[PDB]
Write a protein that binds this ligand. Structure first.
Ligand SMILES: CCCCC[C@@H](O)/C=C/C1=C(C/C=C\CCCC(=O)O)C(=O)CC1
Length: 90
């Protein structure tokens, strides 16, 4: 998606990405939605840029904690996250 509904849906996740319990079920719905939105090639580019703008901007943040989000609610992503991994320009 054009770096927008993703931006909205990550917010409930940010609590945990930054440092917290959960995240909430809303984020889990957000997770399957991110996986579903991030599928066309454009989408990977837009989501990746959204990320390189948002969380990279919020440097005080814990990507490796976020790693645990998918193996918890029960879902996976085409790639994890471009803070300590890569933009995944598929
Ligand atoms: C696990 C999915 C829920 C979000 C938690 C965490 O991974 C945060 C990701 C953020 C993103 C998206 C980052 C990468 C996209 C991965 C999914 C994909 O593109 O297939 C932003 O734009 C800012 C924060």
């Amino acid at each position: 998606i054009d770096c927008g509904h993703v931006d909205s849906l990550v917010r409930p996740c940010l609590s945990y990405v930054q440092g917290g319990p959960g995240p909430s079920g809303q984020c889990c719905d957000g997770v399957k939605n991110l996986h579903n939105q991030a599928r066309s090639q454009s989408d990977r580019q837009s989501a990746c840029n959204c990320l390189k703008g948002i969380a990279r901007g919020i440097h005080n943040l814990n990507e490796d904690n976020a790693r645990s989000i998918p193996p918890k609610c029960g879902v996976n992503l085409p790639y994890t996250i471009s803070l300590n991994i890569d933009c995944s320009r598929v």
